[PDB]
Amino acid sequence: RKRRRHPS
Amino acid sequence: PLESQYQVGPLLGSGGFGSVYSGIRVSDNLPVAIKHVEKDRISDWGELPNGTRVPMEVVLLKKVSSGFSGVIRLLDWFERPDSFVLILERPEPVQDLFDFITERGALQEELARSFFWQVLEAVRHCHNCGVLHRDIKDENILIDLNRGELKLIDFGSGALLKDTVYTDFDGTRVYSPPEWIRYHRYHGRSAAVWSLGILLYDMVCGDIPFEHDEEIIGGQVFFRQRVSSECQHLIRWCLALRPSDRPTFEEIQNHPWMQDVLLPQETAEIHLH
Ligand SMILES: Nc1nc2cc(Br)ccc2o1
């Protein structure tokens, strides 16, 4: 399962 | 003078922290991180204790950087024609908690407990200093791998702490609380507690629970990894849909799951070295 950062 | 007081090295993290460069304070060879913020890009401004107009980020950093804490401290700052330059501590060696969790997967609960505790203490420090971070997430936490100490970074979405309602938000949406998604209104402390529930799930499950607005406001928490009943209870309490149903920081730290925390040096020796 993909895991990603999220922008502010 | 900036270039005359610091040796400036290369970009840190390839821009992933912002315009942050490695540096060394010439006067004592102290390692520093040098962060640049463009005036044109600054949405929120504040006044220093002496009335000087500076980015809110500098205001908040200065407020939390007195004394020792689990926050990367602002050591100095400079104004340039088109930017502000921030001199920060640079612990070494470091890995941010997002990369740490990606590489190691879901953390053992003993390790998550130690990390989460240190994050609670650092957020309490910020609040006690009058500062609301508003962007608590694993990407904004550095691990000092040798000392086992966690450090909060990036107050660029923060605000002065107030007890009245907030109607603005520029932090990370998947860590933001349902009352923000639904009503664009939140109070600082209960919104922080929500983000801490997201962070704790992230630590013990290996990734955050919600990716979509419907999941944030839906109120169902599915556990994708084995997590103790006491830990599930704390997470679900922090992620109560109504803000008044969430624990206070005192209630989080008195929770049964949080007892018998490791010390930072014990954490490093057991889990990080
Ligand atoms: N080693 C190290 N990486 C850092 C990133 C930021 Br942002 C601030 C300080 C740091 O120290």
Q: Topology of B1-92 in CATH?
A: Phosphorylase Kinase; domain 1 (3.30.200)
Residue spans of beta strands (DSSP E) within B102-158: 131-132, 141-144, 149-152
Q: Closest CB to A3: pick one of B102, B170, B171.
A: B102
Question: What does the CA dihedral B240, B244, B250, B255 come to, rounded to 10 degrees?
Answer: -30
List residues in chain A touching B: CB distance below 8 A: 1, 3, 5-8
Please state whether B104 falls in left (phi above 0), alpha (psi between -120 and 50) or beta.
alpha
Report, in angstroms and rounded to the nearest whole number, the Rg of chain A calculated over CA atoms: 7
Residue B179 tokens, joined: 């009352």
Q: E strand or H helix at B111, and its extent?
A: helix B109-128
B20 is in an annotated binding site: yes
Q: E strand or H helix at B238, and its extent?
A: helix B229-238
Q: Report the DSSP beta bridge partners of residue B166.
A: B186
Question: What does the CA dihedral B252, B256, B262, B264 come to, rounded to 10 degrees?
Answer: 0
DSSP state of B254: T
Residue B93, preceding peptide bond in cis (omega within 30° of 0):
yes
Ligand 1 midpoint to CA B62 (Å): 17
Report, in angstroms and rounded to the nearest whole number, the Rg of chain B calculated over CA atoms: 19
- Chain B residues touching residue A1 (CB < 8 angstroms): 207
How many alpha carbons fall within 13 Å on the CB side of residue B223? 17
Residue B31 to residue B44: CA distance in whole angstroms = 29
Q: Topology of B93-273 in CATH?
A: Transferase(Phosphotransferase); domain 1 (1.10.510)
B96: three-class secondary structure by DSSP? strand
Residues lining ligand 1, CB < 6 A? Answer: B 12, 17, 20, 33, 72, 88, 90-92, 94, 142, 153
Contact flag B172-A8 (C-beta cutoff 8 Å)? yes
Way the structure was solved: X-ray
* Domain B1-92 shares a fold with domain B93-273: no
* Every domain of chain B and the residues it spans: 1-92, 93-273
Residue B136 to residue B206: CA distance in whole angstroms = 16
Instruction: Judge whether B245 counts as a catalytic residue.
Output: no
Name residue, tokens 């590489």: B103
**In Å, what resolution does this model reach?**
2.0
Contact flag B139-A1 (C-beta cutoff 8 Å)? no
Nearest to A7 by CA among B171, B18, B208, B168: B171
